[PDB]
Amino acid sequence: SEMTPREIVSELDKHIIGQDNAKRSVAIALRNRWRRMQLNEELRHEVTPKNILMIGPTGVGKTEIARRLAKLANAPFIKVEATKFTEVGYVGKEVDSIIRDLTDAAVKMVRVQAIEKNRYRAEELAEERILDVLIPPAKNNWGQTEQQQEPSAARQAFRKKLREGQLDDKEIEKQKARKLKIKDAMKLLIEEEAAKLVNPEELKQDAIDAVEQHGIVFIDEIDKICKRGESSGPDVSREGVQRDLLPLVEGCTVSTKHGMVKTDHILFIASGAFQIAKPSDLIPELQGRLPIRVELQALTTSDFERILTEPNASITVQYKALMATEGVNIEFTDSGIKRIAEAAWQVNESTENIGARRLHTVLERLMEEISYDASDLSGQNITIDADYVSKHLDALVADEDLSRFIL
Amino acid sequence: SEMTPREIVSELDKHIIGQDNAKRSVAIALRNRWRRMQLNEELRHEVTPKNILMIGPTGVGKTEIARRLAKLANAPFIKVEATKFTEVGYVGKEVDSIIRDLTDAAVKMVRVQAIEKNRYRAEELAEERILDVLIPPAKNNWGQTEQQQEPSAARQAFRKKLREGQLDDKEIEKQKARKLKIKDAMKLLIEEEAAKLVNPEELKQDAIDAVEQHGIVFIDEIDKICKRGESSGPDVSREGVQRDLLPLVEGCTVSTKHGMVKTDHILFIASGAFQIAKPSDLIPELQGRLPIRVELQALTTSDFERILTEPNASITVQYKALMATEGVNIEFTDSGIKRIAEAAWQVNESTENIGARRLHTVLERLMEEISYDASDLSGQNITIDADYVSKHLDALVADEDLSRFIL
Ligand SMILES: Nc1ncnc2c1ncn2[C@@H]1O[C@H](COP(=O)(O)OP(=O)(O)NP(=O)(O)O)[C@@H](O)[C@H]1O
Secondary structure, three states, rough: OOOOOOHHHHHHHHOOOOOHHHOOOOOHHHHHHHHOOOHHHHOOOOOOOEEEEEOOOOOOOOHHHHHHHHOOOOOOOOEEHHHHHOOOOHHHHHHHHHHHHHHHHHHOOHHHHHHOOOOOHHHHHHHHHHHOOOOOOOOOOOOOOOOOOOOOOHHHHHOOOOOOOOOOOOOOOOOOOOOHHHHHHHHHHHHHOOOOOOHHHHHHHHHHHHHHHEEEEEEOOOHHHOOOOOOOOOOHHHHHHHHHHHHHHHEEEOOOOOEEEOOOOOEEOOOOOOOOOOOOOOOOHOOOOOOOOOOOOOOHHHHHHHOOOOOOHHHHHHHHHHHOOOOOOEEEHHHHHHHHHHHHHHHHHHOOOOOOOHHHHHHHHHHHHHHHOOOOOOOOOHHHHOOHHHHOOHHHEEEOOHHHHHO | OOOHHHHHHHHHHOOOOOOHHHHHHHHHHHHHHHHHHHHHHHHHHHOOOOOEEOOOOOOOOOOHHHHHHHHHHHHOOEEEEEOOOOOOOOOOOOHHHHHHHHHHHHHHHHHHHHHHHHOOHHHHHHHHHHHEEEOOOOOOOOOOHHHOOOOOOOOOHHHHHHOOOOOOOEEOOOOEEEEOOOHHHHHHHHOOOOOOOOOHHHHHHHHHHHHHOOOEEEOOOOOOOOOOOOOOOOHHHHHHHHHHHHHHHHHHHHHOOEEEOOOOOOEEEEEEOOOOOOOOOOOOOHHOOOOOEEOOOOOOOOHHHHHHHOOOOHHHHHHHHHHHHOOEHHHHHHHHHHHHOOOOOHOOOOOOOOOOOOHHHHHHHHHHHHOOOOOOOOOOOEEEEEEHHHHHHHHHOOOOOOHHHHH
């Protein structure tokens, strides 16, 4: 029982922005996963996980979308740059890494949780182990097969004096540099028991599945690998990358550190805005394994204003907070934010679209002085208004052959 | 006994449209494999498997034909693009890798095929101890055999009570003695007391019997590695591969982490469309090692149509069930189907004739909304009629660009 296509989207809508379709498509993909494994043996393992090919500029969300999705969808993710496989050093054995990498990034995942579940027998057996101290009851147990509920009582009223009143430094009822104490034992006896419920197999075999079955790969700049003109050079080695991918894509088995895997039931997400080339130029074989094609729209002034603030920890936020530490306090007005955004955009349009990123520069650049002369004006309060903004930037933005340096 | 020529074919056109000849070829080969078993020892290990070279455009079948056959025959198979062996290929000098890989899967196969071939006990024997911890059998039993079917009074009750209701916190028996939950323990013991019957030795030695005997390879893109001349630069590099491959086809042995395998009798299937080169152009020794040459022709719309239906588990067929999963029946009209096919075809006749591959796209994009707006439809009913396809696709198929982007 997973989230409905729209249900998924909503979750994405939380920490993200536009790219709706994108969210939609990615969502769908997630959904199908369920439908897939919910039929008959024949197709059960005969339906190829539809792979998305994100077609948009500057990892403006796409990167995140994929990230977020796989996260909430709870599954092994992995960002891999296409080009990262072109040229000597690491080629064929490096293309297969993708999996390997992920697989590991998975085995680590399956661990950070395989312990969260057994996070009981740790502190419970960590306290009870050091609970067998102070004043013992008797030494007559296992004598009855139906009567055992009274003799053994060293903690039937001492378990509370080990919760808040643990302390101590006892031991029981060449290398040494650590002292054992119920105060630290209540916390250290955990590392011990937490290492008793860890079966490398129940983790290995667990991850391997939660990978070759729920894998999400994000191939960035896939468009790069495509082609150029007629006298292609490192491209005859580029296409190779593509080819070298097919296997994992088309579905296959690769040798890992914790065994072997199956890249068939895996989900991949190509990416990159195609300017020089197009999905069409892409290698048919692969171009065919990359179904769901989604067009990612640019970013609007509005969008910015949002990312400029909305985020749980906006860039404007932490900044005011940073200025705060300096005793100085700033005021990010809705009047200026618009201008802030109003700027970022202008630049992106004038120079070259990038989105989000543009901000860091435009903001930091506008907040120049303030950042510099802080204690030089500590205490008082400053207003970041639409006029204050333009007052600074205004010029720059206009001067194209320059903005390409400070922004 | 194995299927006669057409006997194979029949089971072959089960997922492939036309191109029978190739099937025949692929079929015959399969048959020969057995004929050899009849040809008395004298000519036993004195007979080549006779390998085939498939020659045809893109997305026309080849591949499938292979697998389908490989599957229909139950034998470790593996596709492989030569290309990943040329141009500064330090690994391209590892053409033997092939078997090393065909053996890897060869491993998986028999293995996984062993888990199912031995799972009737895998589960049973598991829950046993479970129930055994549930109703601890009495000590010292008086041999009567039927006296074990008696505890079933409560036992069976419990057993039946377990094949549904569980999640009880127990503890059972480098063995065990851990206190978890019957849920996990059921699958832990299901495995612990599962791998009891495997025999890694005879197992790993069972797999080789496949790769060595029942094994198939699909040397892909052979056409690439061929010729041109006038300054023999990358030429004496490509051809090389061919030679490097010979031994495998010819018949040699390769070192694998699993042992030694004899490519003597193995089905290698070279292929690719020689729009530029020609089989003749290919190195002779090989040209001669590829005795069976068959041609594949481009699929026509009619074929497409057929492809969207007749084939067992056709896209639509899948999509039908796939949609039905979200509790909603769809219906493609003989007219709509035509459209899809037509659509698909049209695109190929303006951008790139990627053949059959085209469909997957077309359709999937045709079912955009539906695939998304699913949960809500639940119980609803919709027919993908001509006027439907034509509504979504027509628009696209009309203009280029897009198609080259999302098709
Ligand atoms: N009879 C068929 N002819 C063509 N394609 C088919 C057929 N039946 C199913 N298909 C689908 O269409 C695809 C055709 O691609 P493939 O099987 O690689 O053919 P191919 O001729 O080997 N391709 P290529 O190497 O690109 O020329 C398959 O992956 C199937 O999903």
